[PDB]
Design a protein around this ligand. Structure first.
Ligand code: HEM
Ligand code: TPF
Length: 453
């Protein structure tokens, strides 16, 4: 098995002391191929990059979701929420059963109007810019996606478009998640001058939980019936057990959903607009579809479903830069992967999604091209070749929510404005635990098409 450069007792860990660790891992995969061993003090992971190996790893009879180091660290504030619980921890399956109905078609139809509310705020913001002002793309997409999950899920308005900097929840969330990403902290977390970081961390967690408090208080004070995600959290009963979620778990789900529910979707919208401005003929075709399909002053649910090419633009953005770029599995028993690589019970695998999605045996030699037409025919994409939403029963519960919101918003953007890559922007991918273009800016010239209420 290939392995990258080690550094004595630190093994491979210094390779990840960099601003862009996933990009570093992709380069290592480029050098070493479909599988490599990665060791840190205390742990071994095998990174997989080929569809033939990832297909086997996605067999749930042999491999289950693993909580990676990052997932274990963030559990300090995500707790035993859906993202951070083991498949055999009781509260995984219990919450899964209670919340799944909140992501049906019916539920999506119910969220649509509130998705439109936030989308209209974005379009209005851009209509109101003065000559020669520009748009900060990831910043505005984060405003939109946070507000969208807040309002759709919790009936809570973050009012991000009324602030010129991030909502304080975001500012604490980013520092709390960055603290966790500082996983290699002198491999001496109990050092001298981390009392500072540890204090700050608790303060950041407290800011997030005080917002959770307001969400729950506002719900309780409400005179109206919301019938949303929070409703199901508070009231829903697991049909396998008869039980509703306990209070502590509810708080962890709210934090889980507010975070997971916006950050990767902001990244996706930003990457999609990047690839559109860099591929003008693709932009033209998407914009022609938006104009033909979005014939009313605001979009209906059924219209968003008809933006097929827009859907393909999003899927092709997720192919090249899947914004949650890795998920971890473990071997349920001793087994052999790909007829060649023996694994012991409990061994960890990490699926490196961007490399999977560059597997030339699947996608051909145009892997780096942005070509949404690749997705014209679903059945021409082998099982387990495209996995931006994870796998099996632990796959993203929010997938259709993300894609409906992103399709609606990108469609409205393409209907209402012409975009200019005025700086000839050079892609710079900032990594947190997710991926996003940094410093991406455009200019938008309004086509002066009225919006509705
Ligand atoms: C483009 C957007 C998104 C992408 C790329 C994404 C990706 C993923 C991935 C890869 C996983 C599996 C994680 C793992 O195996 O450790 C996952 C799980 C999850 N996602 Fe997403 N997601 C997106 C949007 C959303 C949205 C909008 C929500 C919520 C409204 C959401 C909530 C979750 C939850 C709760 C889980 C845990 C599911 C479980 O194991 O029970 N995600 N997502
Ligand atoms: O998988 C996510 C990605 N993420 C990281 N920061 C924000 N989101 C959560 N998710 C699932 N669908 C959407 N997001 C995750 C991965 C690792 C981790 F520690 C936390 C964490 F939330």
């Amino acid at each position: 098995m290939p392995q990258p450069k080690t550094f004595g007792e630190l093994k491979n860990l210094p390779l990840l002391n960099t601003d862009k660790p996933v990009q570093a891992l992709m380069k290592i995969a480029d050098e070493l191929g479909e599988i490599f061993k990665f060791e840190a003090p205390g742990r071994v992971t095998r990174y997989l990059s080929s569809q033939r190996l990832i297909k086997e790893a996605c067999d749930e009879s042999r491999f289950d979701k693993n909580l990676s180091q990052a997932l274990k660290f963030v559990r300090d504030f995500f707790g035993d929420g859906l993202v951070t619980s083991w498949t055999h921890e009781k509260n995984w399956k219990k919450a899964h059963n209670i919340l799944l109905p909140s992501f049906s078609q019916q539920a999506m139809k119910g969220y649509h109007a509130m998705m439109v509310d936030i989308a209209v705020q974005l379009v209005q913001k851009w209509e109101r810019l003065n000559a020669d002002e520009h748009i900060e793309v990831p910043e505005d997409m984060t405003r939109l996606t946070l507000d969208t999950i807040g309002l759709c899920g919790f009936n809570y308005r973050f009012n991000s478009f009324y602030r010129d900097q991030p909502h304080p929840f975001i500012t604490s969330m980013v520092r709390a998640l960055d603290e966790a990403m500082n996983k290699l902290q002198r491999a001496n977390p109990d050092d001298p001058a981390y009392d500072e970081n540890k204090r700050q961390f608790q303060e950041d967690i407290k800011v997030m939980n005080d917002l959770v408090d307001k969400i729950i208080a506002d719900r309780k004070a409400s005179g109206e019936q919301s019938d949303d995600l929070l409703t199901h959290m508070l009231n829903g009963k697991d049909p396998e057990t008869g039980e509703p979620l306990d209070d502590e778990n509810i708080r962890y789900q709210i934090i889980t959903f507010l975070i997971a529910g916006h950050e990767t979707t902001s990244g996706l919208l930003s990457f999609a607009l990047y690839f559109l401005v860099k591929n003008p003929h693709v932009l033209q075709k998407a914009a022609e579809e938006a104009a033909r399909v979005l014939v009313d002053p605001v979009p209906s649910y059924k219209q968003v479903k008809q933006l097929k090419y827009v859907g393909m633009v999003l899927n092709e953005a997720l192919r090249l830069w899947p914004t949650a770029p890795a998920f971890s599995l473990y071997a349920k028993e001793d087994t052999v992967l790909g007829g060649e690589y023996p694994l012991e019970k409990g061994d960890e695998l990490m699926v490196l999604i961007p490399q999977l999605h560059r597997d030339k045996t699947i996608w051909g030699d145009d892997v780096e091209e942005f070509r949404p037409e690749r997705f014209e025919n679903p059945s021409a994409i082998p099982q387990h070749a495209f996995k931006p939403f994870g796998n099996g029963q632990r796959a993203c519960i929010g997938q259709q929510f993300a894609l409906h919101e992103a399709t609606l918003v990108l469609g409205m953007m393409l209907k209402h404005f012409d975009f200019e890559d005025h700086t000839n922007y050079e892609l710079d991918i900032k990594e947190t635990l997710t991926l996003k273009p940094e410093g991406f800016v455009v200019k938008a010239k309004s086509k002066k098409i009225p919006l509705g209420g």
